[PDB]
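DATA SHEET
Item: assembly model
Revision: 1
Owner: S.N.
Input lines:
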Amino acid sequence: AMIYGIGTDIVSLKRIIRLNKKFGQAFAGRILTPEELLEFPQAGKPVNYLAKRFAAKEAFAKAVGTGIRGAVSFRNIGIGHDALGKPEFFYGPALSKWLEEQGISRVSLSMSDEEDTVLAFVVAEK
Amino acid sequence: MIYGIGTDIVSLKRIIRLNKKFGQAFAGRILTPEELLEFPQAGKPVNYLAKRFAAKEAFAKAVGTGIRGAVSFRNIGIGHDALGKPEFFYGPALSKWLEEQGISRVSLSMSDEEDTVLAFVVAEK
Amino acid sequence: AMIYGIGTDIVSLKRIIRLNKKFGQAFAGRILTPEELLEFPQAGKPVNYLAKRFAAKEAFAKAVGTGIRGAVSFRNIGIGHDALGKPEFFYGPALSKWLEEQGISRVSLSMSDEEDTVLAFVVAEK
Ligand SMILES: CC(C)(COP(=O)(O)OP(=O)(O)OC[C@H]1O[C@@H](n2cnc3c(N)ncnc32)[C@H](O)[C@@H]1OP(=O)(O)O)[C@@H](O)C(=O)NCCC(=O)NCCS
Ligand SMILES: CC(C)(COP(=O)(O)OP(=O)(O)OC[C@H]1O[C@@H](n2cnc3c(N)ncnc32)[C@H](O)[C@@H]1OP(=O)(O)O)[C@@H](O)C(=O)NCCC(=O)NCCS
Ligand SMILES: CC(C)(COP(=O)(O)OP(=O)(O)OC[C@H]1O[C@@H](n2cnc3c(N)ncnc32)[C@H](O)[C@@H]1OP(=O)(O)O)[C@@H](O)C(=O)NCCC(=O)NCCS
């Protein structure tokens, strides 16, 4: 009744590097929201920036129970940050609409990385 | 509120080593009867075993006891709902124990990358 | 009841070794609480001990939304264990007070390790 779903994702930087090589310059544009893409050039570690967002979006998609499908899409799931640096989700309008319809009230996020591994942790509440 | 949380990471190489030590009987000791029905057809059997092992260890940590008593590999079953979300199903001894503790719902998420399988579990009371 | 925040951390044992090597015992003196620092000489696996505490404290600081800041400090975030071995937090008095001011009622902890990777997950409620 409290938790709608939980999600975790572990993403290797190597995996992101291979995807970015395979799909070329267009890859970032397929995984990132327009806001994320606008701020990507200022990332200190671009590969890590993509990997974190990739992991966060997959973990989100698990926490809401559907996987990447329909409105639960890379382009609709954006990661932003509050004034203290805490990561938080911001949604394309098709996804905020879907979330309200599912009764999902809020979705929390945490991320970490170490060496070649990025980790995301998501909890969706009712 | 939350009763507890649990997490576990499992090496695919480790599961391989455990298979060699105990033979195919290892799977018979980690998996439930229902899991054992589809296990012979599993396309990636090391990954299949690793996921179940990690999930069951995480479950055991999330209920605060570890693998002990009714909290045992053979009582902790993983299934999936219609959309592919993993979810737990319990043997009778474990389902009773959980309810005795007031634990109402246990949620599960799994991920894997290269050699690492990761499970995270939240038990709610 | 609701979630205040969630936190995760992954920590490499090799990174801990590097940190011990550069700073010597001053690293443990910076990360451990006075209580933990007294029992550290008895840890059967001092690198694994420091790694778990480091990951748990970092995940804690994320779960309360601040990072390491103010009273949310390494020296105020302690790890103990209950009778069955379940890990749990204890707090320096200033942090206990802050948690109470914030309405945080319970912070849950889980840890795991495999090979070089130590992992911590934390959920702060209310
Ligand atoms: C779930 C998803 C986000 C990721 O799948 P993945 O990263 O390949 O798989 P992971 O190893 O991280 O985790 C898989 C686990 O997800 C979990 N999962 C699957 N479907 C799920 C769902 N609907 N809800 C919650 N969890 C789910 C399962 O536990 C699965 O492991 P199991 O089946 O062995 O239990 C999926 O929705 C997807 O579409 N992946 C492809 C993403 C993609 O498009 N990449 C290309 C970039 S353009
Ligand atoms: C605790 C257990 C669940 C996991 O053992 P493990 O995998 O070695 O433990 P992990 O390394 O995953 O995580 C260790 C952490 O578990 C946590 N933990 C221990 N007991 C716990 C408990 N009762 N409740 C919650 N968390 C617990 C602790 O934080 C511990 O690390 P710390 O003591 O350093 O803080 C154990 O009971 C277990 O089941 N081991 C293997 C089971 C087995 O039989 N394997 C052979 C195949 S038959
Ligand atoms: C938050 C903190 C713990 C980050 O730890 P880290 O190991 O540097 O970085 P990790 O990769 O583990 O985690 C980084 C993520 O923490 C998260 N984070 C940052 N500020 C946060 C906050 N206020 N609340 C919650 N999460 C936060 C972000 O998601 C960040 O990644 P992003 O910016 O790419 O989104 C760190 O910034 C901090 O606040 N204090 C550490 C200072 C310190 O003492 N270092 C060691 C000295 S021995």
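QC remark: The radius of gyration of chain B is 14 Å.
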